[PDB]
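Researcher: Here's my situation. A collaborator sent me these components and asked whether they could plausibly form a single complex. I don't have experimental data yet, so a predicted model of the whole assembly would be a useful starting point for our discussion.
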Amino acid sequence: LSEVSVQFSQLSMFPFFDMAHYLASVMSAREQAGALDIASHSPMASWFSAMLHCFGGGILSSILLAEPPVGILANTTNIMLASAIWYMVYYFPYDLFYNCFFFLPIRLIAAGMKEVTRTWKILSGITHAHSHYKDAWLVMITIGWARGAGGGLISNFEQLVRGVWKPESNEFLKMSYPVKVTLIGAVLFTLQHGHYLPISRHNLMFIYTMFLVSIKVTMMLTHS
Amino acid sequence: LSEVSVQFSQLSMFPFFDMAHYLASVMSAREQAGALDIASHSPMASWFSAMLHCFGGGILSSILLAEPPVGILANTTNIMLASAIWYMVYYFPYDLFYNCFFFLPIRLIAAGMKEVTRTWKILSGITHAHSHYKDAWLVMITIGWARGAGGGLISNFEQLVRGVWKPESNEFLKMSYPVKVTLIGAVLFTLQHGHYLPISRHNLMFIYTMFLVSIKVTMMLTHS
Amino acid sequence: LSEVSVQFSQLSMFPFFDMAHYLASVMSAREQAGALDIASHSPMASWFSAMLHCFGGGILSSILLAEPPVGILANTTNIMLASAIWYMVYYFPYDLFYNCFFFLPIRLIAAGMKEVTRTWKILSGITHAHSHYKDAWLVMITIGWARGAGGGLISNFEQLVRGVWKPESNEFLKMSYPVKVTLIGAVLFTLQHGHYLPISRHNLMFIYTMFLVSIKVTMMLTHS
Ligand SMILES: [Ca+2]
């Protein structure tokens, strides 16, 4: 019944789906070591730390294609979409905002939909690197990877923002889950647009997002 | 008597005013921790440290708009304008160069005119970000800010040049004076070019530069 | 007998000469402090460290001219040319690969030809910066320098890749041999393309490469 896979490709990420990535990347960023003291005494700095968690995929991919990293900032509807979350995640009265989304079913859905945004971002840069470079197999793996887990690759430099400098914790030295997966994804869909992979996009686009959500949902059910 | 405000807009920064910024940014850079030993044993490195103090506004703004940061270097009349100061500030015979400009009235005027150069640099990137992005409210605040206090934002990476690595001294964590002001300025003039601010440019362009000079002049009169 | 200098300009670097730079930059990179443990437990990270040794000249020069640093990556015939060496240098069975090229005559020739690749890379960016900026004397010295010893200038950030953070070991603070030479070379050939230097390119292009090889050959004969 492939007729159900076609209805998935018709999902618009701008309203509902862009914020799940913004929230799961901001909730996670706060749960990091000492990130709470940062926001209480330096509001300016915890904010930019959140933006690298959300728009680092766009930020890093812009640095790689010689595109202005301020370009991600121009989308004021997208920037303002992420910063409103950052305020309530931290500065909500009685912290009712974080207490609600931390709830396990809610937190499960919030993180599950960030994995959805991860897929189009791979295909974003894969086709976007296609624009600058037609059939460059590498360049498409990179810019697809750079948008999938950008917040985890600038993480070493994102740590340096909140004040933490751990020069021993690189991403190539030990590949984390959200990154070693986007590497796998950026390679698969590069074989899709390159037609080296025997499955349609809309069927591959749908099967990759499912393995990615079934893990993080299993991850958070066995982490709590 | 607004007729006196119009005569101010007709000020050319290329002869007299470009060097005041170059000098106040190089004099300050030398007065930094251990910057003297750097120039005595590594002339190459104290120089590039001075250039980030002077052209960091241009350097950082180039990195943000995907413009080649070597572009600030092409202006050989401007680069050579700043490096001649760096030699005499450090390597002048009997150090008569620094002893003279350190004099309080002279140092007051030298720093007062760097604040003048700060204003057009804000309007520089505000209109320059307008070129790439028409009515982007954010992008204009950024590239105006990046030219106003560029030497203070690459400062964490500029420290790493002279050898000092202080990963706890970021600019978003504690906003310094020259930076929290340029942020205020980059926002005001972004409301000017965007016509959200009820005052003409040439009247706002003149009133912002005065509050900025009356402070640093009060700063240096109460610091000595 | 200048007729022998003309036959040198007709040397194609793509087959034989591109790999000598790739090997001497990868062999040297492994001989660095703790680089062996990196490759045994983190294959991903020792690789990218090797690429900055080989394509750092292209990588850094791309960052300076606002050119996409992924552009060096698109040349799959060149990227794959360097990565095959990185595998055998490290992961060859019985390490017969490294034991052979470490042999002094072989190591002498391998390093001698990397110095050849150093010359066209200078003239590469000198004429390539000419494209973006006609008679910019500085910009041509830079982009010629950035391709000659790129792996040594991103070295501080390349160290940060393998895990080592030594903020006191900058290149402007103490100019190494491969760098203070490429600075000398990037200046000479900038006077060549600018016609401020009384010698033809093909005669200067040949005399610079000889002084560079006679040193490193004398260096490695007196180092062992
Ligand atoms: Ca560009």
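Model: Some features of this prediction you could bring to your collaborator: The first helix of chain C runs from residue 3 to 9. DSSP finds 14 helices and no strands in chain C.
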